[PDB]
Structure 1
Amino acid sequence: GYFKIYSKHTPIIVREPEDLPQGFSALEPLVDLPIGINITRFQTLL
């Protein structure tokens, strides 16, 4: 039921295309939403 979000902001210095950074960063939890809703599909918003 619970919906959790993990995130960490990192200042990348590497160029933008196809460069997922070769390193390690542990993502910290932000919130724990006590919803009771099933989730099967998702989409980003821009």
Structure 2
Amino acid sequence: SKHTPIIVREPEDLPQGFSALEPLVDLPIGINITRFQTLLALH
């Protein structure tokens, strides 16, 4: 994981530069997973 604040421009995507991510979480799940989905906060 990594987190960075960018305030320069809003509509452009994937800002140009180099950033290093760091290891945080290991989990021995042992599950045959071929698909995923993400959650959204809904009213």
Q: Tell me the TM-score normalised to structure 2 length.
A: 0.74
Structure 2 unaligned blocks of 5 or more:
none
Runs of 4+ deviating beyond 6 Å: none
Query: What is the CA-CA distance between 1:20 and the residue it aligns to?
Result: 1.1
The TM-score, its normalising length taken from structure 1, stands at 0.70
Number of residue pairs aligned between Structure 1 and Structure 2: 40
5+ unaligned residues in a row in structure 1: which ranges? Answer: 1-6
Higher strand share: 1
Q: State the Cα RMSD in Å.
A: 1.2
Cα pair distance change 1:17/1:36, threshold 3 Å: same
Please report how far the alpha carbon of residue 41 of structure 1 lies from its aligned counterpart in structure 2 after TM superposition: 0.6
CA contact (8 A) 1:8 1:28 kept: yes
Q: What is the percent sequence identity of the aligned residues?
A: 100
